[PDB]
């Protein structure tokens, strides 16, 4: 059963940028749609972005549209979240998630199959 | 049928999704039937939301011998 591990969190100044990455163990990454979610304490995990297994289709939450970019390197078994123009409202634990569904949309945390352990992202004014 | 079973079936007929109910995913045991919801008719494949646009129901078949 695939293991997912985030890298890249931490403190960053408002207006700055961060690249999160998430690495999958084994040899199944290429068969998953991949997603990123974020957890603010006191709310459900919020959908951030999703990428089909081929990498040909991507989808964003409107709260990050125009600022974040999701991408994948199937040769490295890694999915990425590039975050630009960061705001204090972006502060959260960010989680990667793998979905056995290889196409289409999926924005509910409950409909993903595997999860990483989360990396804290803190944006100060 | 498990989440894996349902999604792997959708992945197989992904270019055959329509507003018509699929056949049962299995011939024996419990499977799934899928279709594009009528309210979502003509939504292209890559716009279909797993929860909002694809209707799923269980199909019970005779036990596997």
PDB file of C-alpha atoms in Angstrom:
ATOM      1  CA  UNK A   1       0.000   0.000   0.000  1.00  0.00           C
ATOM      2  CA  UNK A   2       1.608   3.210  -1.311  1.00  0.00           C
ATOM      3  CA  UNK A   3       3.194   5.586   1.231  1.00  0.00           C
ATOM      4  CA  UNK A   4       2.953   9.345   0.575  1.00  0.00           C
ATOM      5  CA  UNK A   5       5.370  11.888   2.068  1.00  0.00           C
ATOM      6  CA  UNK A   6       5.213  15.650   1.763  1.00  0.00           C
ATOM      7  CA  UNK A   7       8.228  17.992   1.718  1.00  0.00           C
ATOM      8  CA  UNK A   8       8.659  21.744   1.676  1.00  0.00           C
ATOM      9  CA  UNK A   9       6.474  23.357   4.331  1.00  0.00           C
ATOM     10  CA  UNK A  10       7.482  26.170   6.656  1.00  0.00           C
ATOM     11  CA  UNK A  11       7.391  29.893   7.309  1.00  0.00           C
ATOM     12  CA  UNK A  12       7.189  32.317   4.385  1.00  0.00           C
ATOM     13  CA  UNK A  13       6.499  36.041   4.075  1.00  0.00           C
ATOM     14  CA  UNK A  14       3.233  37.298   2.601  1.00  0.00           C
ATOM     15  CA  UNK A  15       3.643  37.759  -1.141  1.00  0.00           C
ATOM     16  CA  UNK A  16       6.307  35.058  -1.294  1.00  0.00           C
ATOM     17  CA  UNK A  17       6.213  31.603  -2.825  1.00  0.00           C
ATOM     18  CA  UNK A  18       6.781  27.975  -1.794  1.00  0.00           C
ATOM     19  CA  UNK A  19       7.103  24.666  -3.627  1.00  0.00           C
ATOM     20  CA  UNK A  20       5.602  21.664  -1.846  1.00  0.00           C
ATOM     21  CA  UNK A  21       6.332  18.176  -3.117  1.00  0.00           C
ATOM     22  CA  UNK A  22       4.930  14.757  -2.332  1.00  0.00           C
ATOM     23  CA  UNK A  23       6.765  11.517  -3.051  1.00  0.00           C
ATOM     24  CA  UNK A  24       5.113   8.116  -3.434  1.00  0.00           C
ATOM     25  CA  UNK A  25       6.783   4.836  -2.531  1.00  0.00           C
ATOM     26  CA  UNK A  26       6.637   1.816  -4.790  1.00  0.00           C
ATOM     27  CA  UNK A  27       5.513   1.746  -8.416  1.00  0.00           C
ATOM     28  CA  UNK A  28       1.858   2.848  -8.491  1.00  0.00           C
ATOM     29  CA  UNK A  29       2.029   6.671  -8.513  1.00  0.00           C
ATOM     30  CA  UNK A  30       1.400   6.810 -12.274  1.00  0.00           C
ATOM     31  CA  UNK A  31      -1.986   5.110 -11.863  1.00  0.00           C
ATOM     32  CA  UNK A  32      -3.390   7.735  -9.433  1.00  0.00           C
ATOM     33  CA  UNK A  33      -5.006  11.061  -9.878  1.00  0.00           C
ATOM     34  CA  UNK A  34      -3.223  13.193  -7.251  1.00  0.00           C
ATOM     35  CA  UNK A  35      -4.668  15.916  -5.060  1.00  0.00           C
ATOM     36  CA  UNK A  36      -3.640  18.515  -2.505  1.00  0.00           C
ATOM     37  CA  UNK A  37      -5.836  19.501   0.448  1.00  0.00           C
ATOM     38  CA  UNK A  38      -5.306  21.902   3.328  1.00  0.00           C
ATOM     39  CA  UNK A  39      -6.444  21.695   6.953  1.00  0.00           C
ATOM     40  CA  UNK A  40      -7.171  24.824   8.972  1.00  0.00           C
ATOM     41  CA  UNK A  41      -7.928  23.773  12.581  1.00  0.00           C
ATOM     42  CA  UNK A  42     -11.692  23.773  13.115  1.00  0.00           C
ATOM     43  CA  UNK A  43     -12.788  22.991   9.527  1.00  0.00           C
ATOM     44  CA  UNK A  44     -12.879  20.010   7.195  1.00  0.00           C
ATOM     45  CA  UNK A  45      -9.947  19.426   4.852  1.00  0.00           C
ATOM     46  CA  UNK A  46     -10.379  21.853   1.952  1.00  0.00           C
ATOM     47  CA  UNK A  47      -9.717  20.847  -1.642  1.00  0.00           C
ATOM     48  CA  UNK A  48      -6.837  22.800  -3.211  1.00  0.00           C
ATOM     49  CA  UNK A  49      -5.963  21.119  -6.526  1.00  0.00           C
ATOM     50  CA  UNK A  50      -6.133  17.842  -8.482  1.00  0.00           C
ATOM     51  CA  UNK A  51      -4.268  16.341 -11.460  1.00  0.00           C
ATOM     52  CA  UNK A  52      -5.297  13.340 -13.562  1.00  0.00           C
ATOM     53  CA  UNK A  53      -3.020  10.312 -13.683  1.00  0.00           C
ATOM     54  CA  UNK A  54      -1.669  11.258 -17.139  1.00  0.00           C
ATOM     55  CA  UNK A  55      -1.037  14.846 -16.033  1.00  0.00           C
ATOM     56  CA  UNK A  56      -3.157  16.078 -18.957  1.00  0.00           C
ATOM     57  CA  UNK A  57      -5.936  17.662 -16.874  1.00  0.00           C
ATOM     58  CA  UNK A  58      -5.781  19.825 -13.739  1.00  0.00           C
ATOM     59  CA  UNK A  59      -8.381  21.444 -11.481  1.00  0.00           C
ATOM     60  CA  UNK A  60      -8.189  24.145  -8.782  1.00  0.00           C
ATOM     61  CA  UNK A  61     -10.230  25.559  -5.962  1.00  0.00           C
ATOM     62  CA  UNK A  62     -11.250  29.127  -6.760  1.00  0.00           C
ATOM     63  CA  UNK A  63      -9.476  30.365  -3.585  1.00  0.00           C
ATOM     64  CA  UNK A  64      -6.091  29.480  -5.133  1.00  0.00           C
ATOM     65  CA  UNK A  65      -6.924  29.932  -8.849  1.00  0.00           C
ATOM     66  CA  UNK A  66      -4.279  32.037 -10.568  1.00  0.00           C
ATOM     67  CA  UNK A  67      -1.712  31.540  -7.792  1.00  0.00           C
ATOM     68  CA  UNK A  68      -1.102  27.800  -7.308  1.00  0.00           C
ATOM     69  CA  UNK A  69       0.035  25.228  -9.849  1.00  0.00           C
ATOM     70  CA  UNK A  70      -0.180  21.474  -9.459  1.00  0.00           C
ATOM     71  CA  UNK A  71       2.076  19.279 -11.570  1.00  0.00           C
ATOM     72  CA  UNK A  72       3.526  15.787 -11.569  1.00  0.00           C
ATOM     73  CA  UNK A  73       6.685  13.970 -12.564  1.00  0.00           C
ATOM     74  CA  UNK A  74       5.727  10.347 -13.156  1.00  0.00           C
ATOM     75  CA  UNK A  75       9.412   9.511 -13.697  1.00  0.00           C
ATOM     76  CA  UNK A  76      10.075  10.639 -10.089  1.00  0.00           C
ATOM     77  CA  UNK A  77       6.817   9.337  -8.551  1.00  0.00           C
ATOM     78  CA  UNK A  78       6.291  12.883  -7.266  1.00  0.00           C
ATOM     79  CA  UNK A  79       3.480  15.432  -7.409  1.00  0.00           C
ATOM     80  CA  UNK A  80       4.123  19.127  -6.772  1.00  0.00           C
ATOM     81  CA  UNK A  81       2.228  22.187  -5.576  1.00  0.00           C
ATOM     82  CA  UNK A  82       3.776  25.522  -6.586  1.00  0.00           C
ATOM     83  CA  UNK A  83       2.285  28.326  -4.470  1.00  0.00           C
ATOM     84  CA  UNK A  84       2.700  31.968  -5.515  1.00  0.00           C
ATOM     85  CA  UNK A  85       1.467  35.266  -4.049  1.00  0.00           C
ATOM     86  CA  UNK A  86       0.924  33.549  -0.723  1.00  0.00           C
ATOM     87  CA  UNK A  87      -1.545  35.133   1.712  1.00  0.00           C
ATOM     88  CA  UNK A  88      -1.956  34.687   5.481  1.00  0.00           C
ATOM     89  CA  UNK A  89      -5.268  32.953   4.662  1.00  0.00           C
ATOM     90  CA  UNK A  90      -3.173  30.244   2.983  1.00  0.00           C
ATOM     91  CA  UNK A  91      -1.740  29.184   6.366  1.00  0.00           C
ATOM     92  CA  UNK A  92      -2.610  25.500   6.872  1.00  0.00           C
ATOM     93  CA  UNK A  93      -1.368  21.939   7.019  1.00  0.00           C
ATOM     94  CA  UNK A  94      -1.155  20.815   3.380  1.00  0.00           C
ATOM     95  CA  UNK A  95      -1.769  17.138   2.530  1.00  0.00           C
ATOM     96  CA  UNK A  96      -1.225  15.167  -0.653  1.00  0.00           C
ATOM     97  CA  UNK A  97      -3.778  12.464  -1.483  1.00  0.00           C
ATOM     98  CA  UNK A  98      -3.962   9.729  -4.131  1.00  0.00           C
ATOM     99  CA  UNK A  99      -7.160   8.783  -5.942  1.00  0.00           C
ATOM    100  CA  UNK A 100      -7.544   5.477  -7.781  1.00  0.00           C
ATOM    101  CA  UNK A 101      -9.900   7.292 -10.180  1.00  0.00           C
ATOM    102  CA  UNK A 102      -7.604   8.242 -13.026  1.00  0.00           C
ATOM    103  CA  UNK A 103      -9.753  10.964 -14.630  1.00  0.00           C
ATOM    104  CA  UNK A 104     -12.388  13.594 -13.907  1.00  0.00           C
ATOM    105  CA  UNK A 105     -12.954  15.815 -10.887  1.00  0.00           C
ATOM    106  CA  UNK A 106     -13.001  14.943  -7.208  1.00  0.00           C
ATOM    107  CA  UNK A 107     -13.109  17.636  -4.505  1.00  0.00           C
ATOM    108  CA  UNK A 108     -14.222  15.710  -1.382  1.00  0.00           C
ATOM    109  CA  UNK A 109     -11.513  14.478   0.995  1.00  0.00           C
ATOM    110  CA  UNK A 110     -13.634  11.387   1.701  1.00  0.00           C
ATOM    111  CA  UNK A 111     -13.350  10.258  -1.947  1.00  0.00           C
ATOM    112  CA  UNK A 112      -9.543   9.985  -1.926  1.00  0.00           C
ATOM    113  CA  UNK A 113      -7.890   6.677  -1.139  1.00  0.00           C
ATOM    114  CA  UNK A 114      -4.400   7.359   0.328  1.00  0.00           C
ATOM    115  CA  UNK A 115      -3.042  10.294   2.347  1.00  0.00           C
ATOM    116  CA  UNK A 116       0.303  11.759   3.291  1.00  0.00           C
ATOM    117  CA  UNK A 117       1.032  13.091   6.764  1.00  0.00           C
ATOM    118  CA  UNK A 118       0.770  16.812   6.116  1.00  0.00           C
ATOM    119  CA  UNK A 119       3.282  19.644   6.076  1.00  0.00           C
ATOM    120  CA  UNK A 120       2.688  22.923   7.897  1.00  0.00           C
ATOM    121  CA  UNK A 121       2.644  26.100   5.819  1.00  0.00           C
ATOM    122  CA  UNK A 122       2.664  29.404   7.721  1.00  0.00           C
ATOM    123  CA  UNK A 123       2.363  32.778   5.984  1.00  0.00           C
ATOM    124  CA  UNK A 124       3.107  35.859   8.070  1.00  0.00           C
ATOM    125  CA  UNK A 125       2.045  39.355   7.066  1.00  0.00           C
TER     126      UNK A 125
ATOM    127  CA  UNK B   1     -18.250  -3.215  -4.075  1.00  0.00           C
ATOM    128  CA  UNK B   2     -15.210  -1.376  -2.755  1.00  0.00           C
ATOM    129  CA  UNK B   3     -14.132   2.126  -3.711  1.00  0.00           C
ATOM    130  CA  UNK B   4     -11.280   0.475  -5.642  1.00  0.00           C
ATOM    131  CA  UNK B   5     -13.695  -1.795  -7.524  1.00  0.00           C
ATOM    132  CA  UNK B   6     -15.985   1.117  -8.471  1.00  0.00           C
ATOM    133  CA  UNK B   7     -13.171   3.423  -9.611  1.00  0.00           C
ATOM    134  CA  UNK B   8     -11.238   0.759 -11.498  1.00  0.00           C
ATOM    135  CA  UNK B   9     -14.466  -0.060 -13.339  1.00  0.00           C
ATOM    136  CA  UNK B  10     -14.995   3.621 -14.182  1.00  0.00           C
ATOM    137  CA  UNK B  11     -11.392   3.831 -15.412  1.00  0.00           C
ATOM    138  CA  UNK B  12     -12.083   0.933 -17.785  1.00  0.00           C
ATOM    139  CA  UNK B  13     -15.276   2.329 -19.352  1.00  0.00           C
ATOM    140  CA  UNK B  14     -14.112   5.933 -19.002  1.00  0.00           C
ATOM    141  CA  UNK B  15     -14.586   6.702 -22.728  1.00  0.00           C
ATOM    142  CA  UNK B  16     -17.947   4.860 -22.676  1.00  0.00           C
ATOM    143  CA  UNK B  17     -19.633   6.916 -19.935  1.00  0.00           C
ATOM    144  CA  UNK B  18     -23.120   8.092 -20.902  1.00  0.00           C
ATOM    145  CA  UNK B  19     -26.451   8.852 -19.288  1.00  0.00           C
ATOM    146  CA  UNK B  20     -27.363   5.149 -19.769  1.00  0.00           C
ATOM    147  CA  UNK B  21     -26.847   2.713 -16.891  1.00  0.00           C
ATOM    148  CA  UNK B  22     -23.853   0.481 -17.465  1.00  0.00           C
ATOM    149  CA  UNK B  23     -24.257  -3.276 -17.089  1.00  0.00           C
ATOM    150  CA  UNK B  24     -23.267  -4.729 -13.747  1.00  0.00           C
ATOM    151  CA  UNK B  25     -19.499  -4.667 -13.199  1.00  0.00           C
ATOM    152  CA  UNK B  26     -19.656  -8.354 -12.181  1.00  0.00           C
ATOM    153  CA  UNK B  27     -21.597 -11.404 -13.329  1.00  0.00           C
ATOM    154  CA  UNK B  28     -21.573 -12.993  -9.854  1.00  0.00           C
ATOM    155  CA  UNK B  29     -21.448 -11.413  -6.418  1.00  0.00           C
ATOM    156  CA  UNK B  30     -21.999  -7.736  -5.678  1.00  0.00           C
ATOM    157  CA  UNK B  31     -20.971  -5.170  -8.281  1.00  0.00           C
ATOM    158  CA  UNK B  32     -21.717  -1.577  -9.295  1.00  0.00           C
ATOM    159  CA  UNK B  33     -23.708   0.076 -12.049  1.00  0.00           C
ATOM    160  CA  UNK B  34     -22.790   3.593 -13.145  1.00  0.00           C
ATOM    161  CA  UNK B  35     -24.157   6.354 -15.340  1.00  0.00           C
ATOM    162  CA  UNK B  36     -23.866  10.071 -15.874  1.00  0.00           C
ATOM    163  CA  UNK B  37     -26.650  11.730 -13.897  1.00  0.00           C
ATOM    164  CA  UNK B  38     -29.378  13.200 -16.152  1.00  0.00           C
ATOM    165  CA  UNK B  39     -28.751  16.648 -14.665  1.00  0.00           C
ATOM    166  CA  UNK B  40     -25.135  16.274 -15.847  1.00  0.00           C
ATOM    167  CA  UNK B  41     -25.892  15.008 -19.351  1.00  0.00           C
ATOM    168  CA  UNK B  42     -23.293  15.916 -22.017  1.00  0.00           C
ATOM    169  CA  UNK B  43     -20.643  16.877 -19.438  1.00  0.00           C
ATOM    170  CA  UNK B  44     -17.366  15.739 -21.060  1.00  0.00           C
ATOM    171  CA  UNK B  45     -15.377  12.967 -19.398  1.00  0.00           C
ATOM    172  CA  UNK B  46     -12.737  15.226 -17.881  1.00  0.00           C
ATOM    173  CA  UNK B  47     -15.366  17.497 -16.284  1.00  0.00           C
ATOM    174  CA  UNK B  48     -17.304  14.682 -14.550  1.00  0.00           C
ATOM    175  CA  UNK B  49     -17.106  14.959 -10.762  1.00  0.00           C
ATOM    176  CA  UNK B  50     -16.888  11.572  -9.060  1.00  0.00           C
ATOM    177  CA  UNK B  51     -19.411  12.515  -6.366  1.00  0.00           C
ATOM    178  CA  UNK B  52     -21.611  15.079  -8.153  1.00  0.00           C
ATOM    179  CA  UNK B  53     -21.927  13.775 -11.734  1.00  0.00           C
ATOM    180  CA  UNK B  54     -21.567   9.971 -11.670  1.00  0.00           C
ATOM    181  CA  UNK B  55     -24.502   8.025 -10.251  1.00  0.00           C
ATOM    182  CA  UNK B  56     -23.621   4.680  -8.686  1.00  0.00           C
ATOM    183  CA  UNK B  57     -25.834   1.849  -7.485  1.00  0.00           C
ATOM    184  CA  UNK B  58     -25.070  -1.668  -6.279  1.00  0.00           C
ATOM    185  CA  UNK B  59     -26.000  -4.668  -8.430  1.00  0.00           C
ATOM    186  CA  UNK B  60     -26.413  -7.992  -6.659  1.00  0.00           C
ATOM    187  CA  UNK B  61     -25.804 -11.084  -8.758  1.00  0.00           C
ATOM    188  CA  UNK B  62     -26.014 -14.739  -7.811  1.00  0.00           C
ATOM    189  CA  UNK B  63     -23.244 -16.002  -5.539  1.00  0.00           C
ATOM    190  CA  UNK B  64     -19.985 -17.067  -7.161  1.00  0.00           C
ATOM    191  CA  UNK B  65     -19.500 -20.828  -7.457  1.00  0.00           C
TER     192      UNK B  65
END
